[PDB]
Amino acid sequence: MPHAFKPGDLVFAKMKGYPHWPARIDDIADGAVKPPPNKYPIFFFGTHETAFLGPKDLFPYDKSKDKYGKPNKRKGFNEGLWEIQNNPHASYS
């Protein structure tokens, strides 16, 4: 039975204007900017961008990969697919 989202969780994350995108829930570093309430820090594989999203835009990676885990013309996407499959917990700084 599912829990709330926690840092380390792998997802596809949905932003307007973009396809469902390989991502993870990030930690917040000591001293770093906190997200707004009820939002999560989302790290997008491939582009290495961070956005703040709520659960309605977060789809568990395992359940959704068959649908969303296919190659895409969009910049960074295919790099993103490799990262989430091959080293999803790596430092990408």
With residue 24 as reference, give the H or E element that holds it: strand 21-25
Q: What is the dihedral angle through the alpha carbons of 83, 57, 1, 28, rounded to the nearest 10 degrees?
A: 60
The number of folded domains in the chain is 1
Q: Determine the structural domain holding residue 32 and report its residue range.
A: 10-86
Does the residue 16 lie in any domain?
yes
Q: What is the CATH number of the domain that holds 33?
A: 2.30.30.140
Which experiment gave this structure? X-ray
Give the other-Cβ count within 10 Å of 81's Cβ.
Answer: 20
Give the other-Cβ count within 10 Å of 48's Cβ.
Answer: 13
Q: Please state, in angstroms and rounded to a whole number, the distance separating the CA atoms of residues 37 and 75.
A: 30
